[PDB]
Design a protein around this ligand. Structure first.
Ligand code: FES
Ligand SMILES: [K+]
Ligand SMILES: [Mg+2]
Ligand SMILES: [Mg+2]
Ligand SMILES: [Mg+2]
Ligand SMILES: [Mg+2]
Ligand SMILES: [Mg+2]
Ligand SMILES: [Mg+2]
Ligand SMILES: [Mg+2]
Ligand SMILES: [Mg+2]
Lengths: 86, 295, 168, 110
RNA sequence: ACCACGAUCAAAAGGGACAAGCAUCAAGCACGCAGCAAUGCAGCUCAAAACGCUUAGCCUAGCCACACCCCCACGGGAAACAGCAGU
């Protein structure tokens, strides 16, 4: 969201995000189905499937997003550029 | 001449193994412990049936019945009475031979008393010294308080009888007085409340059956098997009863009448069974439901 | 990622999966193989996959390779007695080669089990000492025995500070 | 059979024949790189007693340890020439070869 | 106890293995071999790091080294707590 005022940017961002929704598959509704290792531009993300009770041991931004998706147990490591948007 | 079978006889072990049953879901129940991420395999229908076959073999090893031993006789043997040492010490010494390659039941463990006597250690002193120098995982030098009567009733109220038997097996020796006392109190609580299903598919079911048959109290377990459509087990239970009590009213009635199958349960229900009336009724209800399915 | 093809070979787990533990007589193992030819394919995979596992389990056996010296691949073992064992490996796969040398010059599962047991006798459970060598450092760790004064102060009667005070 | 020499049997490549009755042999062993967990060749020189001066630079020889060293650096003796340089005999067939090609076909003597 | 043709323990001697940094330390300079000897041959080590400089007790159930200095200790300088307490 972009605007001169911060509250206007907040409005634009959250109202627009609800029209660009993904659906994320979850194994047993608590973790991912398999280890995920990818690169987006210069940002590397490595995610590991974990058992119940492991918790979210990830970059704080990944923790925030995982709570919104519904993932409870996962390990993630971010390498390279730590660009938030990437 | 004619010896009565023992618990470890091939004929008895085969009967008790079938009566126990094998439920992979219960035998391999998920344990609450530190977890690791699971692994995955792609299998055909044949590979899956083979993997399930190996699981049944691993379960039959986990269901291996512990041997039922008689209570050990107390140890009271003096090696020497050195009276010249009388009154020279106030505390007794316990000497333990810790030579590595020796069976624990062959290790010499002696005690020098303040009176000068050199005697062999008692069974309780032995098992305590063996745990001090050869610590076994799950065993404690001091007897846990869970085995007190007040705390065992709490475990029975929660239907944790198998946990009591797992705790007892890890703490006491099979021929120990504490081991036999706890097992009998657990069997008696199962018989009083009809909780025989708690021990099915476990290595403790055979020991429980062996206890009921020797003490002539199979009426409860027999009723439980008929109510669950386990007549193949209920018939083997009556046969095992006749084998261990050949000169009995029921055993003779089966010979005179040449009873077989369900007929054995009827002969037993009339002669030696204490709850004979409740067995005939429970057995009658079974034959009805079996006729409805036939018709 | 780890460099090279089949990086699994450069892991301790893979190297310990070798089942060939030569008898004490084996001193040298030469490998003659050809870089090209369909009939020497199993010998090339043997050099590529298994030689590291053999060397890992037999660190004191000399292993030397030779390329394209003869028309066909073969292994040759030199024993301490002076005997030489020739093994023709042309047409065989690398798995069949490992199973062959294991049968003629490898220690059986019985001989290896015994050796592992004789090692367990070196760490007696009843001995007290540093954690590197013993399970427990002091008898005070055994329940029922007098605990360490650093955790449970001893009664004044069992302390020399007050034994000498009363006596003096 | 006992001997005070450490390396009892070793195979190596002759790299020098300038000493009288002595062949300089290069012996290579596989040594594990602890960090990379990859095996690399580690070479060492051995002087071997060659009474008949039959060693040629480049041939593969088998060395046997002497009971006691005969000189400061001579602890082994030539036990056998495994691969004579440029005159290899295929051990599998017993025929002479030149690289990966036979000089005499194995079918000659059936 | 004494002999133990032995066991245990463990020197000297022989073989092998064994720290870090610097290659702007790149060559070392006799460092080899044969022969019973006389003597003969000219070899030996080294970029897979010789030779050299600098730093450091170590791989800790403990081990190594040192014991005022001259690596050593006949001798010399000289008159000794790096045993405990203490200055
Ligand atoms: S460590 Fe055992 S008495 Fe202190
Ligand atoms: K000194
Ligand atoms: Mg020495
Ligand atoms: Mg350079
Ligand atoms: Mg400079
Ligand atoms: Mg150097
Ligand atoms: Mg220093
Ligand atoms: Mg001083
Ligand atoms: Mg000195
Ligand atoms: Mg001082």
């Amino acid at each position: 969201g972009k605007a001169t005022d911060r509250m206007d940017a907040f409005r634009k961002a959250k109202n627009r995000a609800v029209h660009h929704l993904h659906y994320i598959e979850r194994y047993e509704d608590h973790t991912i189905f398999h280890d995920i290792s990818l690169r987006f531009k210069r940002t590397h993300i490595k995610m590991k499937k974990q058992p119940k009770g492991y918790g979210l041991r990830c970059h704080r931004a990944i923790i925030t997003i995982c709570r919104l998706i519904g993932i409870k147990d996962m390990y993630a490591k971010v390498s390279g550029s730590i660009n938030m948007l990437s | 001449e004619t010896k009565k079978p023992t618990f470890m006889d091939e004929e008895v072990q085969s009967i008790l193994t079938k009566m126990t049953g094998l439920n992979l879901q219960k035998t391999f129940k998920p344990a609450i412990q530190e977890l690791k991420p699971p692994t995955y395999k792609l299998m055909t229908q044949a590979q899956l049936e083979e993997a399930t076959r190996q699981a049944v073999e691993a379960a039959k090893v986990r269901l291996k019945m512990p041997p039922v031993l008689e209570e050990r006789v107390p140890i009271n043997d003096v090696l020497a009475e050195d009276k010249i040492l009388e009154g020279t010490e106030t505390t007794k010494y316990v000497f333990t031979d810790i030579s590595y390659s020796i069976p624990h039941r062959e290790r010499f463990i002696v005690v020098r008393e303040p009176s000068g006597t050199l005697r062999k250690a008692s069974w309780e002193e032995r098992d305590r010294m063996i745990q001090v120098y050869f610590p076994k995982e799950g065993r404690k030098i001091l007897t846990p308080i869970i085995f007190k009567e007040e705390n065992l009733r709490t475990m029975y109220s929660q239907d944790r009888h198998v946990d009591v038997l797992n705790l007892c097996f890890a703490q006491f020796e099979p021929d120990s007085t504490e081991y036999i006392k706890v097992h009998h109190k657990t069997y008696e609580d199962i018989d009083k409340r009809g909780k025989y299903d708690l021990l099915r598919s476990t290595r403790y079911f055979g020991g429980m059956v062996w206890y009921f048959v020797n003490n002539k109290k199979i009426d409860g377990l027999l009723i439980d098997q008929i109510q669950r459509d386990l007549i193949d087990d209920a018939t083997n239970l009556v046969q095992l009863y006749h084998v261990l009590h050949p000169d009995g009213q029921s055993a003779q009635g089966a010979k005179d009448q040449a009873a077989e199958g369900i007929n054995l349960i009827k002969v037993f229900a009339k002669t030696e069974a204490q709850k004979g009336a409740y067995i005939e009724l429970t057995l009658q209800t079974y034959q009805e439901a079996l006729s409805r399915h036939s018709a | 990622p780890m460099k090279g093809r089949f990086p699994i070979r450069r892991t301790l787990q893979y190297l310990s999966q070798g089942n060939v533990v030569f008898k004490d007589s084996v001193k040298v193992m030469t490998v003659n193989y050809n870089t090209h030819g369909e009939l020497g394919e199993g010998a090339r995979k043997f050099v590529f996959f298994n030689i590291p596992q053999i060397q890992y389990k037999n660190p004191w056996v000399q292993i030397m390779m030779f390329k394209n010296m003869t028309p066909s691949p073969f292994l040759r073992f030199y024993l301490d007695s002076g005997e030489q064992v020739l093994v023709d490996v042309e047409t065989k796969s690398n798995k069949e080669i490992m199973e062959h040398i294991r049968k003629i010059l490898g220690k059986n599962e019985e001989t290896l089990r015994e050796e592992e047991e004789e090692k367990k006798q070196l760490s007696h459970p009843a001995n007290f000492g540093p954690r590197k060598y013993c399970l427990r450092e002091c008898i005070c760790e055994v329940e029922g025995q007098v605990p360490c004064p650093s955790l449970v102060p001893l009664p004044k009667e069992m302390r020399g500070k007050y034994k000498a005070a009363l006596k003096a | 059979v006992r001997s005070s020499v450490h390396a009892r049997w070793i195979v190596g490549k002759v790299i020098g024949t300038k000493m009288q009755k002595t062949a300089k042999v290069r012996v290579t062993r596989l040594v594990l790189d602890p960090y990379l967990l990859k095996y690399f060749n580690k070479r060492k020189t051995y002087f071997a007693h060659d009474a008949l001066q039959q060693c040629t630079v480049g041939d593969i020889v088998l060395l046997r340890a002497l009971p006691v060293p005969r000189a400061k650096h001579v602890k082994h003796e030539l036990a056998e020439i495994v691969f004579k340089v440029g005159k290899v005999i295929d051990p599998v067939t017993g025929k002479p070869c030149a690289g990966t090609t036979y000089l005499e076909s194995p079918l000659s003597s059936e």
